Amino acid sequence: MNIFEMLRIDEGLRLKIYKDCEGYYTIGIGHLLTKSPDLNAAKSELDKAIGRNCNGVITKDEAEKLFNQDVDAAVRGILRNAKLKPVYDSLDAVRRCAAINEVFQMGVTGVAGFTNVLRMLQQKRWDEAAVNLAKSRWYNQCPDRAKRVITTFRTGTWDAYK
Numbered sequence: 001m002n003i004f005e006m007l008r009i010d011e012g013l014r015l016k017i018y019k020d021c022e023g024y025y026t027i028g029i030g031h032l033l034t035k036s037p038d039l040n041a042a043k044s045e046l047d048k049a050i051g052r053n054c055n056g057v058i059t060k061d062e063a064e065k066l067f068n069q070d071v072d073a074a075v076r077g078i079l080r081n082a083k084l085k086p087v088y089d090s091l092d093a094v095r096r097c098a099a100i101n102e103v104f105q106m107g108v109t110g111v112a113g114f115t116n117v118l119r120m121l122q123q124k125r126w127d128e129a130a131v132n133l134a135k136s137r138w139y140n141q142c143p144d145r146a147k148r149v150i151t152t153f154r155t156g157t158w159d160a161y162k
Contacts (some may be wrong), residue, residue: 028063
């Protein structure tokens with residue numbers, strides 16, 4: 001499946017501001033608004049992201065616009081980064097999606113900082129890479145959102161998304 005379909009499964013789609021697994025205000029398909037507990041701060045961040053007055057609710061079209069911007073930023077981010085680009089180029093199609101997903105979730109600097117996992121992936125040490133990812137705060141603070149990505153790095157199949 002494609003990266004949009006994969007992230008839709010991991011992140012869900014919600015049109016109103018909600019709290020994610022870590023308690024953080026989120027909207028759309030995994031678009032983090034703020035780590036502040038102030039709902040009104042999340043609303044102000046949403047109005048900034050869209051450029052108009054939203055009162056904490058967006059349309060599916062606006063959700064998809066944010067999603068497509070966030071995916072584009074992850075893909076361009078990988079492909080200009082001296083650590084991530086050789087890893088991405090080395091991976092098979094399925095694990096390339098898992099890499100984009102991980103960068104979407106953690107950010108470029110978060111993924112580029114896991115230099116052990118990157119070496120393992122480059123070297124085809126899939127089991128070792130998955131064990132190491134399962135030690136991360138990313139996974140342990142919110143297992144349901146990360147578990148399919150980890151399985152996908154291990155197996156190289158789409159089975160966890162079926």
